[PDB]
Amino acid sequence: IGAPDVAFPRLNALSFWLFLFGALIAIAGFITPGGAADFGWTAYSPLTDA
């Protein structure tokens, strides 16, 4: 588009780090003894209940 930078370039830096760290804690369910999320990716309701 001919722009020099994005509208809020400290915000897109935050977006990447929110992506990275948010992703890591999701994958981090594996290191727990029980495992990661066993329910499907869709994560239907009663199966995801406590």
Binding site: P4, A13, L14
Partner: protein, 139 residues
């Protein structure tokens, strides 16, 4: 910003039509009347687009045609002082880490860690917001 507003106006029209037709055809011809989940979601995405498009239309009527929005505009026309764009900053990663601490505190139901993460999020957001306003040390 005429086209920018018109995009959201078109989206709002479509989503309003979708919400209305869904609500009607679910109030009748459904097992239990109005679904109340799809209906509300469609109504409030219509609201999303309506808010954004209304603001864009207000701006379009308040603004004279910009070089960006003007066909047959030369580069020199838009040449000038662009505004402040934040240079290098390490506050975003700290905000992300603080929010991750709060998130793990929520997942592993640890109220102490939730409180610590919220305090860190407040601190990191304060740092990011004040980054370019903190004055020199007065000694």
């Amino acid at each position: 910003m005429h086209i920018e507003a018109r995009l959201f106006e078109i989206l709002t029209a479509f989503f309003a039509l979708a919400a209305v037709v869904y609500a009607v055809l679910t109030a009748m011809f459904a097992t239990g009347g109005v679904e109340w989940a799809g209906t509300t979601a469609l109504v409030l995405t219509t609201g999303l687009t309506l808010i954004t498009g209304t603001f864009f239309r207000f701006v379009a009527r308040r603004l004279d045609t910009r070089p960006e929005d003007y066909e047959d505009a030369e580069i020199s026309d838009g040449a000038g002082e662009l505004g402040f764009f934040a240079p290098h900053s390490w506050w975003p990663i700290l905000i992300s880490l603080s929010f991750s601490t709060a998130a793990v505190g929520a997942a592993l139901w640890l109220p102490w860690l939730i409180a610590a993460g919220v305090a860190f999020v407040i601190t990191s957001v304060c740092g990011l917001v004040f980054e370019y306003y903190w004055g020199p040390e007065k000694h």
